[PDB]
A paper describes a structure:
In this study, we designed SCM mutants by substituting the Cys41 residue with three hydrophobic amino acid residues—i.e., Ala, Val, and Leu—generating SCM C41A, C41V, and C41L, respectively. Differential scanning fluorimetric analysis revealed that substituting Cys41 with Ala or Val increased the thermal stability of SCM, while substitution with Ser or Leu decreased its stability. Furthermore, under all three different pH conditions the relative order of the Tm values of the SCM mutants was the same; that is, C41A > C41V > WT > C41S > C41L. The SCM C41A and C41V mutants were crystallized under slightly different conditions, resulting in having different space groups (i.e., P1 for C41A, and P21 for C41V). The mode of dimer formation in both SCM C41A and C41V was similar to that seen in the WT. Models for all 94 residues were successfully constructed for the C41V mutant, while the models for the loop between the β2 and β3 strands (i.e., residues Glu48–Arg51) in the C41A mutant could not be constructed due to poor electron densities. In addition, the two molecules in an asymmetric unit were superimposed Cα-RMSD values of 0.177 Å and 0.356 Å for SCM C41A and C41V, respectively. In the SCM C41A and C41V mutants, the main chain structures around the 41st residue were found to be almost identical to those of WT SCM and the C41S mutant. The superior thermal stability observed after substitution with Ala or Val may therefore be attributed to the absence of their side-chain deprotonation, which can decrease thermal stability, as well as their interactions with surrounding residues.
Author numbering: 1 to 47, 52 to 94
The structure:
């Protein structure tokens, strides 16, 4: 696949919210409150397209985490791949 840097507009913020919502279902960090996604946001496109992956820096409950998210082209399904941290600011 190929990687590009993307903006941190509303669509990206909603991916961050997705990630925190999914991590809350897992419960590994306890209950987290989504704050914001910060730069840099990275997007991978996997080939007709199979899907996408995102690597995001997400503040939740005033702590910084790294979240990876997949998105399937044909099913539109999103999945949280991993959620790690706290991490230092980029």
């Amino acid at each position: 696949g190929e990687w590009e840097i993307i903006d941190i507009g509303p669509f990206t913020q909603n991916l961050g919210k997705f990630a925190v919502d999914e991590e809350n279902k897992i419960g590994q960090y306890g209950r987290l409150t989504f704050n914001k996604v910060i730069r840099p946001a990275m997007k991978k496109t996997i080939y007709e397209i199979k899907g996408y992956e995102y690597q995001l820096y997400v503040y939740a409950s005033d702590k910084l985490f790294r979240a990876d998210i997949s998105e399937d082209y044909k099913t539109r399904g999103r999945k949280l791949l991993r959620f790690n941290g706290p991490v230092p600011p980029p």
